Amino acid sequence: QSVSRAAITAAYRRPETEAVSMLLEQARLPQPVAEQAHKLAYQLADKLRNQKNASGRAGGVALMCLAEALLRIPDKATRDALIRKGVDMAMRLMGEQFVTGETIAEALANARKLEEKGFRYSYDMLGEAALTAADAQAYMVSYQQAIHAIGKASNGRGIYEGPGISIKLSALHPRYSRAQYDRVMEELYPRLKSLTLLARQYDIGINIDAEESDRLEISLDLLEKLCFEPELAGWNGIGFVIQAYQKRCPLVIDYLIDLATRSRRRLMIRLVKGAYWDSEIKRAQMDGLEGYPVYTRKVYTDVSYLACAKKLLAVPNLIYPQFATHNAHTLAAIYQLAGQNYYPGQYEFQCLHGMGEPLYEQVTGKVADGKLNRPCRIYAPVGTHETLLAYLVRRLLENGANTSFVNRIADTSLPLDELVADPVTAVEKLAQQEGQTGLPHPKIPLPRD
Ligand SMILES: Cc1cc2nc3c(=O)[nH]c(=O)nc-3n(C[C@H](O)[C@H](O)[C@H](O)COP(=O)(O)OP(=O)(O)OC[C@H]3O[C@@H](n4cnc5c(N)ncnc54)[C@H](O)[C@@H]3O)c2cc1C
């Protein structure tokens, strides 16, 4: 193939100057909206930094120990007068903060606390990249069991206010990374269909997570078919992730808008930046192809996310946008771009368990409690230590990258105004300095170079 699908294919690895130049005016926040976003982003970030007055205290150590000792003198007068194992253990130590529970039942029992404050959940049974038939079957069973449990705890609250599930197509088909069209359709699809039908019976959201870029196309074929199942007609609980770090992302949105039209539904669309960037670059560098399927400067991903957010927010009849981010500017800009006259079903935010709660405690909840009154859905990984590895590694990359917001916020030296700097302005600043808009990262030449 269709006009919308062909356009996706042709953007796969489009030159970065070109891609970024095309996104720029689509992402630009109008003057007024830009400054309200700056102001809200600044406040959110400031409050995150200075939680227990960790700024005002920052404004030696030897004297403090002596001063401490003197203050333990009770009477003022007297005071005046005078390899394989270490890796496994490191992974589960760092990983506990990211896991909401070992079993789906323990994860749900712990859901009341934030659900009452207005948070929602999407549970993920940890596991991906099934190698064998037995692995994939076992994932299929863990997903079914999860859907029964979440569905019973949802108890009719529905797709927006109630919990959902997130699934990985790589978990449901052995050797998914290289599987061909015909075998995926014969084997993967019936399983996707079956879980989705089950999610529909309990009226919970079911979201298909996005993985590596060479699986985008097949995920779209699977989604297309799913959306035309007679048994799913009139049901708007199907969710799909799109990754703004991909050059294809805006063309994927055009496709999704048309799909929602043709299949007569509202799609739940989770807009993310993306989790596999280090691997995507390495992959593209090994295949020696004409370009990258992702951007090479982080600020360009920020610009793509804003442009894509506008596209999504423009079609509320077709798309329920789920804006996944821990970046205060991103959050603030979405909040402003969504416009006046918010209603619950317009959009929600999302965050990963162990990363987002502090930012979103300023967001989800009552205006009279100093909150924004916008719902946030926490992504909640569920499983034991043997299913954690890949997810943890991705979190370490995310938390430890010096371009990450969550890394830069903890950097006292970097002033708030730089931390929440408008990405469009940053791209324009780079373009005046370097002589062209959207030049690739200077340390990431094309694969053929
Ligand atoms: C609820 C939730 C669900 C998610 N589901 C998925 C999913 O299904 N699939 C998936 O891939 N991701 C998923 N993610 C996104 C991913 O896990 C990261 O959390 C997300 O990219 C971090 O973005 P941010 O806005 O919080 O942080 P920011 O710091 O603003 O941006 C971080 C990122 O920018 C990108 N980046 C970093 N360096 C560069 C560079 N040099 N050039 C271009 N881009 C760069 C990467 O995407 C990286 O994550 C999910 C995130 C959340 C919160």
Ligand code: PRO
């Ligand atoms: O697996 C990951 O890293 C992303 C984050 C949440 C869901 N998918």
